[PDB]
Amino acid sequence: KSRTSELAVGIFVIIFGIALFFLAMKVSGLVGTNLSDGYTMKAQFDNVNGLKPRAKVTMSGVTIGRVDSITLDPVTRLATVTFDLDGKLTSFNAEQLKEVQKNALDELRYSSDYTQATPAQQKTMEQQLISNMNSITSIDEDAYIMVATNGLLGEKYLKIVPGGGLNYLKRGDTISNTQGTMDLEDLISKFIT
Amino acid sequence: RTSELAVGIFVIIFGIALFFLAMKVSGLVGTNLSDGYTMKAQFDNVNGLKPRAKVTMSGVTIGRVDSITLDPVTRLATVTFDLDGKLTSFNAEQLKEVQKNALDELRYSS
Amino acid sequence: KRGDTISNTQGTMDLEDLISKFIT
Amino acid sequence: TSELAVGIFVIIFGIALFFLAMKVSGLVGTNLSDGYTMKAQFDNVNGLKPRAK
Amino acid sequence: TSELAVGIFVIIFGIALFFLAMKVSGLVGTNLSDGYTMKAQFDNVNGLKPRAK
Amino acid sequence: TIAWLGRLVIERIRGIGVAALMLLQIIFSLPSAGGFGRFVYQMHRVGVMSLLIITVSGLFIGLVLGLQGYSILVNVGSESMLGTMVSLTLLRELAPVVAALLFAGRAGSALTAEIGSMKQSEQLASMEMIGVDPLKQIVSPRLWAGIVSLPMLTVIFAAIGIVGGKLVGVDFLGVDEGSFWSGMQNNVQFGHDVVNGIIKSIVFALLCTWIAVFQGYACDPTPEGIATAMTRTVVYSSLCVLGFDFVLTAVMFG
Amino acid sequence: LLIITVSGLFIGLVLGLQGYSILVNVGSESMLGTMVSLTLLRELAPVVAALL
Amino acid sequence: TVIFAAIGIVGGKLVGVDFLGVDEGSFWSGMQNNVQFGHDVVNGIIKSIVFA
């Protein structure tokens, strides 16, 4: 019965390795997955009272991303919050991008002054203004961020308010225009007392 | 022996009689055969909305929110909306009545 | 009829504007 | 082997303390001392409780 | 052969004993941080819990 | 000294390899349909004979959940919460585990003991010379009775647990039938609160019965081995149910 | 000890995940402490341990 | 029984607080609020003497 022995171990190793894989893989349905294209962004704030890691991010009320980390800079007194946004929702489809690239340039060359530039300069501007868009998402130049509340009880989350700009921010950059929350004793000090 | 198999059969029957109780507990959802009607709607903000949120006309339940997505170049939300047509489609008599009223007026005002 | 788009817009309103409506 | 049983069972005891002390910390209550009783009169204690602070 | 039995003995055996202790103390009572302390007066700490942020 | 553990581990794991091979043969090829008409008999000893235990335990679990739920829920929402918690607890976590372990006990040790004796007495072995493959004649209907029986028992356990919960939570302790029933309908979806209980039940039924057959059909023909096999089938299927329950629930509701 | 320890770890992790997926619909996560402790101390340790 | 619960609580925290984003302070506070060593732990033990 010496010959059967070997085969038995080989079967074990394979069935067992599969079982280990199954566990490691299947649990990813809930833990360890970003569920996104992975672009990140930064922003700074004056008051982030009641945010949590894993609070939602939205545009127009559509879930668009996650708040990953919160940290304080001790010499500026500002909080820094890091985002994780999903490219499938924030990037432009390439066909849509063609439209975006072209209408952005029409405003930049005709409402603004690129057509008055040396034609060589005009081409240079168009070439890099557009090749730079291979690095962008839909959030424009004037987009706000502010912290948001969820329900009349619940955890605090982050809101993006787009619109009115021409150019776009590159993934990895910092959104500059931000506004902080209000604490309860200071709604009171501002409007009641 | 039949004295042993009669029971083997019995247990499955029992096993069904209390299956039903499980269905009374979950209730009936996901209706109805005239499901096909779906609708689209545009919104500026959908912050608290969810898949499986209910839909109403005058408070009667008539449908479900199925999917919420963003259009990145219009910056609008678009909602995929299952309208349970069983309660919104006209039956033949009812159709004749709305149809007649609307046709009578169509050829009077135009 | 069938599956058209309802031709009307009316979204929700956040505590942001419920508050901005008034000055504090 | 009896020597192993003796040299090994001590582990269930080392483990018993480690986890029991953890349990005390996780659910530690209030250790009162030098307590006194006092009484006071009231007109209404609606919804006051037998273990209130 | 003992070549394999010895390698098999060490794996898991030498992991599991430490594993049980470290995966508990790191969660229930052993820690390390560069902590500093400060004191303050208050007139009325109503309801502030001992573990508040 | 130390190498002893080494050898123990190596051999136990070899055995799992063997079990996998056995399972493949029993499920892979079963052409003898004419003899499978008897599995309905076999079911008598797995399914029919186990309702008493599953039923009694289901009632006690339902009543206990009722009382503990209530003493916590009076501070939060018993009117709405007894319904939702009794039904979700039984459908998601307890019918698939409590019934699975009671079954592993009552059917599992009995089944392994029976195969064990078939082997120890040499009775089983005598079939090889008659040309009747014992896997198709002895093992097949036992493994199948296990697959069908546990899932049906799992449903009954929950059905009784609901009766138990209501019997104390609503009828002795002062709660509305209306909100109990509607609460359950509002939060319990067939898809997938009832369905996931059933899926987990199938997984456990296969894993647990598979082990009971495998250990009963032991290598070493020594009387001491029957008692050892019985203890081991309870221990191994018990840990496997808990291990797999964790992963499956993690996916289903995560 | 080995069997009871492995069982305790899986039960703990299961309660954690089931509690959480219910609590996120209350929005009250402080309950993980309160419920993991009460469930194990009052009903499961005395029953799961007794049955294993 | 005690060891089982102890492992179970730790397993609970390990996922409930450490993987799932719950502020830890509320976990330990939630345990103290309101289950106690002198009551609920004691009843868990009494039941285990009976079962043993």
mmCIF file of N, CA and C in Angstrom, chain A residues 105-179:
data_model
loop_
_atom_site.group_PDB
_atom_site.id
_atom_site.type_symbol
_atom_site.label_atom_id
_atom_site.label_comp_id
_atom_site.label_asym_id
_atom_site.label_seq_id
_atom_site.Cartn_x
_atom_site.Cartn_y
_atom_site.Cartn_z
ATOM 1 N N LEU A 105 -11.353 74.779 -25.053
ATOM 2 C CA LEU A 105 -10.509 75.630 -25.855
ATOM 3 C C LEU A 105 -11.293 76.703 -26.548
ATOM 4 N N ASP A 106 -12.525 76.447 -26.984
ATOM 5 C CA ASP A 106 -13.210 77.546 -27.633
ATOM 6 C C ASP A 106 -13.344 78.722 -26.689
ATOM 7 N N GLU A 107 -13.636 78.469 -25.420
ATOM 8 C CA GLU A 107 -13.736 79.624 -24.547
ATOM 9 C C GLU A 107 -12.375 80.269 -24.325
ATOM 10 N N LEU A 108 -11.344 79.451 -24.172
ATOM 11 C CA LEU A 108 -10.014 79.963 -23.895
ATOM 12 C C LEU A 108 -9.385 80.730 -25.068
ATOM 13 N N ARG A 109 -9.698 80.342 -26.294
ATOM 14 C CA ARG A 109 -9.117 81.073 -27.387
ATOM 15 C C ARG A 109 -9.982 82.251 -27.851
ATOM 16 N N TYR A 110 -11.327 82.159 -27.752
ATOM 17 C CA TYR A 110 -12.178 83.230 -28.270
ATOM 18 C C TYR A 110 -12.770 84.202 -27.238
ATOM 19 N N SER A 111 -13.131 83.732 -26.033
ATOM 20 C CA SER A 111 -13.729 84.629 -25.039
ATOM 21 C C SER A 111 -12.564 85.303 -24.334
ATOM 22 N N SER A 112 -11.515 84.510 -24.205
ATOM 23 C CA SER A 112 -10.226 84.857 -23.649
ATOM 24 C C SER A 112 -9.335 85.147 -24.853
ATOM 25 N N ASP A 113 -8.051 85.402 -24.648
ATOM 26 C CA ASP A 113 -7.173 85.832 -25.728
ATOM 27 C C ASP A 113 -6.183 84.852 -26.392
ATOM 28 N N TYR A 114 -6.401 83.527 -26.431
ATOM 29 C CA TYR A 114 -5.338 82.764 -27.102
ATOM 30 C C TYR A 114 -5.260 83.084 -28.578
ATOM 31 N N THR A 115 -6.342 83.506 -29.237
ATOM 32 C CA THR A 115 -6.211 83.760 -30.678
ATOM 33 C C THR A 115 -5.338 84.972 -30.984
ATOM 34 N N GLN A 116 -4.980 85.745 -29.958
ATOM 35 C CA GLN A 116 -4.152 86.920 -30.130
ATOM 36 C C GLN A 116 -2.676 86.580 -29.914
ATOM 37 N N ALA A 117 -2.410 85.336 -29.524
ATOM 38 C CA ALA A 117 -1.074 84.834 -29.257
ATOM 39 C C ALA A 117 -0.388 84.499 -30.571
ATOM 40 N N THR A 118 0.929 84.458 -30.577
ATOM 41 C CA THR A 118 1.623 84.063 -31.787
ATOM 42 C C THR A 118 1.048 82.692 -32.120
ATOM 43 N N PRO A 119 0.665 82.359 -33.359
ATOM 44 C CA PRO A 119 0.124 81.051 -33.708
ATOM 45 C C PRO A 119 0.966 79.901 -33.133
ATOM 46 N N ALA A 120 2.293 80.061 -33.058
ATOM 47 C CA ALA A 120 3.121 79.018 -32.466
ATOM 48 C C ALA A 120 2.777 78.824 -30.983
ATOM 49 N N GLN A 121 2.471 79.936 -30.298
ATOM 50 C CA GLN A 121 2.117 79.953 -28.893
ATOM 51 C C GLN A 121 0.738 79.372 -28.746
ATOM 52 N N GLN A 122 -0.125 79.638 -29.727
ATOM 53 C CA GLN A 122 -1.479 79.136 -29.644
ATOM 54 C C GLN A 122 -1.474 77.633 -29.711
ATOM 55 N N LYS A 123 -0.652 77.088 -30.604
ATOM 56 C CA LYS A 123 -0.582 75.653 -30.738
ATOM 57 C C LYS A 123 0.029 75.040 -29.508
ATOM 58 N N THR A 124 1.061 75.676 -28.950
ATOM 59 C CA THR A 124 1.703 75.134 -27.769
ATOM 60 C C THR A 124 0.694 75.066 -26.630
ATOM 61 N N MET A 125 -0.073 76.141 -26.434
ATOM 62 C CA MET A 125 -1.034 76.136 -25.358
ATOM 63 C C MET A 125 -2.056 75.050 -25.574
ATOM 64 N N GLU A 126 -2.568 74.907 -26.784
ATOM 65 C CA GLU A 126 -3.582 73.895 -26.994
ATOM 66 C C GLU A 126 -3.028 72.498 -26.748
ATOM 67 N N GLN A 127 -1.799 72.254 -27.182
ATOM 68 C CA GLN A 127 -1.204 70.942 -27.047
ATOM 69 C C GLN A 127 -1.013 70.501 -25.617
ATOM 70 N N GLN A 128 -0.574 71.395 -24.734
ATOM 71 C CA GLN A 128 -0.358 70.942 -23.372
ATOM 72 C C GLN A 128 -1.592 71.130 -22.524
ATOM 73 N N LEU A 129 -2.424 72.104 -22.829
ATOM 74 C CA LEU A 129 -3.622 72.251 -22.032
ATOM 75 C C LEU A 129 -4.432 70.995 -22.185
ATOM 76 N N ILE A 130 -4.426 70.438 -23.392
ATOM 77 C CA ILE A 130 -5.159 69.234 -23.658
ATOM 78 C C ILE A 130 -4.418 67.960 -23.269
ATOM 79 N N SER A 131 -3.117 67.815 -23.522
ATOM 80 C CA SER A 131 -2.504 66.547 -23.122
ATOM 81 C C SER A 131 -2.509 66.410 -21.597
ATOM 82 N N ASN A 132 -2.599 67.536 -20.885
ATOM 83 C CA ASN A 132 -2.679 67.553 -19.440
ATOM 84 C C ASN A 132 -3.987 66.964 -18.967
ATOM 85 N N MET A 133 -4.973 66.889 -19.837
ATOM 86 C CA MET A 133 -6.274 66.428 -19.439
ATOM 87 C C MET A 133 -6.314 64.924 -19.370
ATOM 88 N N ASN A 134 -5.222 64.285 -19.718
ATOM 89 C CA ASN A 134 -5.194 62.853 -19.603
ATOM 90 C C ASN A 134 -5.020 62.509 -18.116
ATOM 91 N N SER A 135 -4.728 63.540 -17.317
ATOM 92 C CA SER A 135 -4.523 63.441 -15.901
ATOM 93 C C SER A 135 -5.696 63.980 -15.082
ATOM 94 N N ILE A 136 -6.840 64.316 -15.709
ATOM 95 C CA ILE A 136 -7.890 64.973 -14.919
ATOM 96 C C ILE A 136 -9.160 64.237 -14.713
ATOM 97 N N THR A 137 -9.898 64.799 -13.766
ATOM 98 C CA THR A 137 -11.240 64.388 -13.424
ATOM 99 C C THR A 137 -12.156 65.590 -13.615
ATOM 100 N N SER A 138 -13.452 65.373 -13.472
ATOM 101 C CA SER A 138 -14.508 66.356 -13.688
ATOM 102 C C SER A 138 -14.602 67.519 -12.718
ATOM 103 N N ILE A 139 -13.926 67.436 -11.601
ATOM 104 C CA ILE A 139 -14.033 68.512 -10.647
ATOM 105 C C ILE A 139 -13.249 69.678 -11.187
ATOM 106 N N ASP A 140 -13.893 70.826 -11.283
ATOM 107 C CA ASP A 140 -13.239 71.972 -11.869
ATOM 108 C C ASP A 140 -12.575 72.882 -10.847
ATOM 109 N N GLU A 141 -12.070 73.972 -11.370
ATOM 110 C CA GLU A 141 -11.313 74.979 -10.682
ATOM 111 C C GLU A 141 -12.014 75.624 -9.526
ATOM 112 N N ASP A 142 -13.322 75.778 -9.609
ATOM 113 C CA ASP A 142 -14.011 76.503 -8.563
ATOM 114 C C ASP A 142 -14.778 75.595 -7.646
ATOM 115 N N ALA A 143 -14.570 74.305 -7.769
ATOM 116 C CA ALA A 143 -15.375 73.416 -6.963
ATOM 117 C C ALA A 143 -15.133 73.606 -5.489
ATOM 118 N N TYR A 144 -16.187 73.639 -4.689
ATOM 119 C CA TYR A 144 -16.072 73.718 -3.241
ATOM 120 C C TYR A 144 -15.927 72.312 -2.669
ATOM 121 N N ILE A 145 -15.351 72.223 -1.480
ATOM 122 C CA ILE A 145 -15.644 71.124 -0.576
ATOM 123 C C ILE A 145 -16.209 71.721 0.698
ATOM 124 N N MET A 146 -17.180 71.037 1.305
ATOM 125 C CA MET A 146 -17.614 71.266 2.688
ATOM 126 C C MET A 146 -17.974 69.940 3.375
ATOM 127 N N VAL A 147 -17.784 69.814 4.689
ATOM 128 C CA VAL A 147 -18.289 68.665 5.472
ATOM 129 C C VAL A 147 -19.822 68.688 5.572
ATOM 130 N N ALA A 148 -20.436 67.516 5.672
ATOM 131 C CA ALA A 148 -21.873 67.274 5.608
ATOM 132 C C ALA A 148 -22.316 66.264 6.674
ATOM 133 N N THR A 149 -23.613 66.214 6.976
ATOM 134 C CA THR A 149 -24.096 65.708 8.275
ATOM 135 C C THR A 149 -24.711 64.312 8.231
ATOM 136 N N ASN A 150 -25.072 63.817 7.047
ATOM 137 C CA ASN A 150 -25.993 62.687 6.862
ATOM 138 C C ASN A 150 -27.419 62.999 7.387
ATOM 139 N N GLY A 151 -28.050 62.127 8.178
ATOM 140 C CA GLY A 151 -29.379 62.362 8.770
ATOM 141 C C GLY A 151 -29.401 63.345 9.956
ATOM 142 N N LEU A 152 -30.560 63.502 10.605
ATOM 143 C CA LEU A 152 -30.690 64.309 11.831
ATOM 144 C C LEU A 152 -30.119 63.629 13.079
ATOM 145 N N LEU A 153 -29.666 62.387 12.950
ATOM 146 C CA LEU A 153 -28.585 61.819 13.749
ATOM 147 C C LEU A 153 -27.835 60.811 12.876
ATOM 148 N N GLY A 154 -26.526 60.686 13.068
ATOM 149 C CA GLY A 154 -25.646 59.937 12.174
ATOM 150 C C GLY A 154 -24.274 60.588 12.029
ATOM 151 N N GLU A 155 -23.399 59.928 11.285
ATOM 152 C CA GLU A 155 -22.018 60.363 11.088
ATOM 153 C C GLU A 155 -21.808 61.389 9.983
ATOM 154 N N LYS A 156 -20.743 62.180 10.124
ATOM 155 C CA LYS A 156 -20.458 63.290 9.221
ATOM 156 C C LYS A 156 -19.650 62.777 8.027
ATOM 157 N N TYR A 157 -19.890 63.324 6.839
ATOM 158 C CA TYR A 157 -19.353 62.911 5.531
ATOM 159 C C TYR A 157 -18.883 64.135 4.722
ATOM 160 N N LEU A 158 -18.355 63.989 3.504
ATOM 161 C CA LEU A 158 -17.758 65.103 2.743
ATOM 162 C C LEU A 158 -18.474 65.472 1.415
ATOM 163 N N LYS A 159 -18.836 66.755 1.149
ATOM 164 C CA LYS A 159 -19.600 67.107 -0.066
ATOM 165 C C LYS A 159 -18.803 67.942 -1.061
ATOM 166 N N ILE A 160 -18.822 67.557 -2.337
ATOM 167 C CA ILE A 160 -18.166 68.267 -3.441
ATOM 168 C C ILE A 160 -19.221 69.024 -4.234
ATOM 169 N N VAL A 161 -19.009 70.312 -4.475
ATOM 170 C CA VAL A 161 -19.977 71.179 -5.154
ATOM 171 C C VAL A 161 -19.335 71.775 -6.413
ATOM 172 N N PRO A 162 -19.447 71.102 -7.572
ATOM 173 C CA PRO A 162 -18.810 71.522 -8.801
ATOM 174 C C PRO A 162 -19.547 72.621 -9.514
ATOM 175 N N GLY A 163 -18.906 73.164 -10.540
ATOM 176 C CA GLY A 163 -19.559 74.029 -11.502
ATOM 177 C C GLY A 163 -19.062 75.462 -11.600
ATOM 178 N N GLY A 164 -19.064 75.958 -12.843
ATOM 179 C CA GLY A 164 -18.659 77.309 -13.205
ATOM 180 C C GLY A 164 -17.241 77.474 -13.753
ATOM 181 N N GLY A 165 -16.384 76.459 -13.644
ATOM 182 C CA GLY A 165 -15.014 76.641 -14.143
ATOM 183 C C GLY A 165 -14.804 76.174 -15.573
ATOM 184 N N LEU A 166 -13.558 76.267 -16.045
ATOM 185 C CA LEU A 166 -13.237 75.817 -17.390
ATOM 186 C C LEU A 166 -12.251 74.668 -17.370
ATOM 187 N N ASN A 167 -11.227 74.798 -16.539
ATOM 188 C CA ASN A 167 -10.184 73.802 -16.491
ATOM 189 C C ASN A 167 -10.512 72.787 -15.451
ATOM 190 N N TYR A 168 -9.650 71.806 -15.328
ATOM 191 C CA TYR A 168 -9.869 70.734 -14.393
ATOM 192 C C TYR A 168 -8.679 70.454 -13.543
ATOM 193 N N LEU A 169 -8.946 69.874 -12.389
ATOM 194 C CA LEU A 169 -7.875 69.527 -11.494
ATOM 195 C C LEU A 169 -7.367 68.144 -11.804
ATOM 196 N N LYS A 170 -6.065 67.982 -11.669
ATOM 197 C CA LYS A 170 -5.421 66.708 -11.888
ATOM 198 C C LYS A 170 -5.547 65.802 -10.699
ATOM 199 N N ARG A 171 -5.663 64.524 -10.967
ATOM 200 C CA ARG A 171 -5.727 63.603 -9.862
ATOM 201 C C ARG A 171 -4.424 63.719 -9.125
ATOM 202 N N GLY A 172 -4.487 63.715 -7.796
ATOM 203 C CA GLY A 172 -3.316 63.861 -6.955
ATOM 204 C C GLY A 172 -3.138 65.299 -6.453
ATOM 205 N N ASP A 173 -3.886 66.247 -7.004
ATOM 206 C CA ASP A 173 -3.732 67.626 -6.553
ATOM 207 C C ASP A 173 -4.613 67.934 -5.341
ATOM 208 N N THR A 174 -4.529 69.172 -4.865
ATOM 209 C CA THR A 174 -5.321 69.656 -3.744
ATOM 210 C C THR A 174 -6.379 70.673 -4.148
ATOM 211 N N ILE A 175 -7.601 70.440 -3.707
ATOM 212 C CA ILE A 175 -8.691 71.368 -3.992
ATOM 213 C C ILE A 175 -8.560 72.510 -3.034
ATOM 214 N N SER A 176 -8.523 73.732 -3.546
ATOM 215 C CA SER A 176 -8.291 74.880 -2.687
ATOM 216 C C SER A 176 -9.464 75.505 -1.972
ATOM 217 N N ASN A 177 -10.642 75.419 -2.523
ATOM 218 C CA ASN A 177 -11.738 76.124 -1.899
ATOM 219 C C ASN A 177 -12.567 75.260 -1.001
ATOM 220 N N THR A 178 -12.464 75.540 0.288
ATOM 221 C CA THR A 178 -13.093 74.760 1.336
ATOM 222 C C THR A 178 -13.754 75.642 2.389
ATOM 223 N N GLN A 179 -14.733 75.079 3.080
ATOM 224 C CA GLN A 179 -15.524 75.730 4.112
ATOM 225 C C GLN A 179 -15.788 74.749 5.253
#
